Amino acid sequence: MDPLSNFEHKVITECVTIVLGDAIQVAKCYGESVLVNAANTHLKHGGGIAGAINAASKGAVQKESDEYILAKGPLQVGDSVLLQGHSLAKNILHVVGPDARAKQDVSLLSKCYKAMNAYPLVVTPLVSAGIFGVKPAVSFDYLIREAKTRVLVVVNSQDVYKSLTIV
Known part of the structure; x- marks a missing residue:
């Protein structure tokens, strides 16, 4: 009855567990979870996890976002x-992290991760860590500092995962 028994994962804190793989797959295991989307300011879901989430929804997510x-x-x-x-x-929580390419303020990740504490179970990527160019370890540091709820942080890359889990 514990979906994590079928995933490669590491318990980080009493609140936070990091999971290797596909966030959408993990979220589907937990009916009550809120899945975070790493969104842009206009909720234009063209690539990365946002594109995957919209594809999984067969476009329903983008239609809603447009409205x-x-x-x-x-x-x-x-x-x-x-x-x-x-x-x-x-639910899907569309979170807009800072884009380092645009020299946005990285400490806005504190705001991002605090928003997740509203929900009892959250499944999230590391915010701002793809195309937005924030190093995974920095995004992870913010998450671990701010988490006050059950969070499953999911990383698609085995190499990022190893970098964060091997101490």
Whole structure:
């Protein structure tokens, strides 16, 4: 009854566990989980995990996001918005991390990860660690500092995973 028994993972803190692999697969194991999307300010889900999440939803996520943006406007960096889960999770929390390419303020990851503490179980990538160019270890440091809820942080790369788990 413990989905983690079928995943390569390491318990990091009493709140945080890091899991190797596919965040969408992990989230599907937990009906009550909130899945974080690593989003941009306009919720344009064109690549990375956002693209994977929209693909998994057969476009439903992008349709919802399009409506959201016209109704409420774009997000600011560091903001997040809770939207529908689309059968991937209970809800999807679209979180906008800082983009180091744009020289945005990396300490806005504190805001990002604090937003996840609203939910009792969160499945998340490391925010800002792909195309946004924040080193995985820095994003992980912020998560571990800020977490106050059950978080499964999921990393697709075995090499990132090893870098974070081997001490």
